[PDB]
Ligand binder design. Structure first.
Ligand SMILES: C[S@@+](CC[C@H](N)C(=O)[O-])C[C@H]1O[C@@H](n2cnc3c(N)ncnc32)[C@H](O)[C@@H]1O
Ligand SMILES: [Cl-]
Ligand SMILES: [Zn+2]
Ligand SMILES: [Zn+2]
Lengths: 115, 298
């Protein structure tokens, strides 16, 4: 029942003081967007940067199978918004954080559905 | 210069009417760098200015618009230009990209391999090409018309570009083709566009706007490339990134341009008039099928 867990391998490489994956495609935008995590068009707000989805996907970048039964990708063809404070490692940010299913913002980075 | 606030500079009409001899390109800006917004790649800035400029033309923009992008990969293994085209094109637009080398894209579909192995049953509304071979830059030989992928691009425009469609093909002092200049005469309007962020490069985008399928003016490719070099040698362009700080009017407006599947014996003068204004696209509206040839040899 073997299978390569790349998400864990990258986190272990980051904790080991490794260099984050670079060349993530940062987009030009007004920075007056919704602030939602993954969008069809850049929706960065003043506290965020928008990136090309494919360039921020660990699976797409390492050319390995996606952890989705049909081998489908969430980021490819979309735009992922990353807090300006974490834009130094967008791939690592998408692996560690979760998208709120009711408002669409990142958990603990905009999602306020818990108040 | 009020051109600093433009996304780039188009070749003035008076330079297109000359008969100059091909000379070496010698830019005064050469070696300079534009101040890019923090963390933005050159190709994101470059494609953004190209798109800002295309927003000013009579592009046909139908529903389910079909766009193909050649030379979309990079040494980094990502497709910065494709990400900008995805941001620029209206939702529901089909975006297919291709490159000789493996790369990761935001396109609906990506084909890997020589552009000569790419086949497609259907026609396209817009063709973008950033295909370039650094070998072509040779100052120890004559600067002659180049073939390679240009031969494929010329056949692709003539047989797969929808009437009313437009193209943006990247050229340089040495990466150019005489037949591609000749073909710009088959469009309602054409120009050579230089982005302000790369104004220090002999690079330019030949823009054919609204394909008529027949020659409107007779263009000598050798003479026109000589005219392009003369324009670049005599008109220094101030490097500028000003147009990049205002993205409020960036997205291409969906005009819902009409798509008709007309036969060739029906193209009258009143139809060519609608193609010229960017108010009509002529191609089948069938499903999109693409394929990559695989040469098998053990
Ligand atoms: C300037 S790079 C393209 C950069 C890309 N537009 C970007 O956004 O970064 C030129 C590309 O043309 C590709 N190319 C050159 N000759 C080709 C050919 N005959 N068929 C397909 N791709 C080709 C190269 O592999 C290279 O990736
Ligand atoms: Cl060159
Ligand atoms: Zn992916
Ligand atoms: Zn929420």
């Amino acid at each position: 029942a073997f299978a390569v867990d790349a998400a864990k391998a990258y986190k272990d490489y980051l904790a080991s003081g490794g260099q984050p994956i670079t060349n993530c495609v940062k987009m030009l935008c007004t920075h007056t967007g919704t602030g939602q995590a993954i969008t069809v068009t850049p929706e960065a707000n003043m506290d965020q940067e928008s990136f090309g989805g494919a360039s921020c996907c660990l699976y797409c970048r390492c050319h390995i199978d996606h952890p989705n039964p049909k081998g489908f990708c969430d980021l490819k063809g979309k735009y992922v918004q990353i807090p300006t404070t974490c834009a130094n490692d967008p791939v690592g940010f998408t692996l560690k954080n979760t998208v709120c299913t009711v408002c669409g913002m990142w958990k603990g980075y905009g999602c306020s559905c818990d108040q | 210069s009020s051109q600093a606030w433009q996304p780039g500079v188009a070749m003035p009409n008076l330079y297109k009417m000359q008969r100059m001899l091909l000379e070496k390109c010698d830019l005064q800006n050469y070696g300079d760098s534009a101040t890019l917004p923090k963390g933005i790649m050159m190709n994101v800035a470059k494609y953004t200015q190209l798109c800002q400029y295309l927003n000013t033309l009579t592009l046909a923009v139908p529903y389910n618009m079909r766009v193909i992008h050649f030379g979309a990969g990079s040494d980094k293994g990502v497709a910065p230009g494709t990400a900008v085209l995805r941001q620029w094109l209206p939702t529901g637009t089909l975006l297919v990209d291709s490159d000789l080398n493996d790369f990761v894209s935001d396109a609906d579909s990506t084909l890997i391999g020589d552009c000569a192995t790419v086949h497609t049953a259907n026609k396209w509304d817009l063709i973008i090409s950033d295909m370039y071979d650094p070998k072509t830059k040779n100052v120890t030989k004559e600067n002659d018309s180049k073939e390679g992928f240009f031969t494929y691009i010329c056949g692709f425009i003539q047989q797969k570009l929808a009437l009313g469609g437009s193209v943006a093909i990247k050229i340089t002092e040495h990466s150019w083709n005489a037949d591609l200049y000749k073909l710009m005469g088959h469009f309602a309007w054409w120009t050579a566009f230089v982005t302000n962020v790369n104004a220090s490069s002999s690079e330019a985008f030949l823009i054919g706007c609204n394909y008529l399928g027949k020659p409107r003016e007779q263009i000598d490719g050798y003479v026109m490339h000589a005219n392009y070099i003369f324009w670049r040698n005599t008109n220094p362009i101030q490097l500028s990134s000003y147009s990049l700080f205002d993205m409020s009017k960036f997205p291409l407006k969906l005009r819902g341009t009409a798509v008709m599947s007309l036969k060739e014996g029906q193209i009258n003068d009143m139809i060519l008039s609608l193609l010229s204004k960017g108010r009509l696209i002529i191609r089948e509206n069938n499903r999109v099928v693409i394929s990559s040839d695989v040469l098998v040899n053990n």
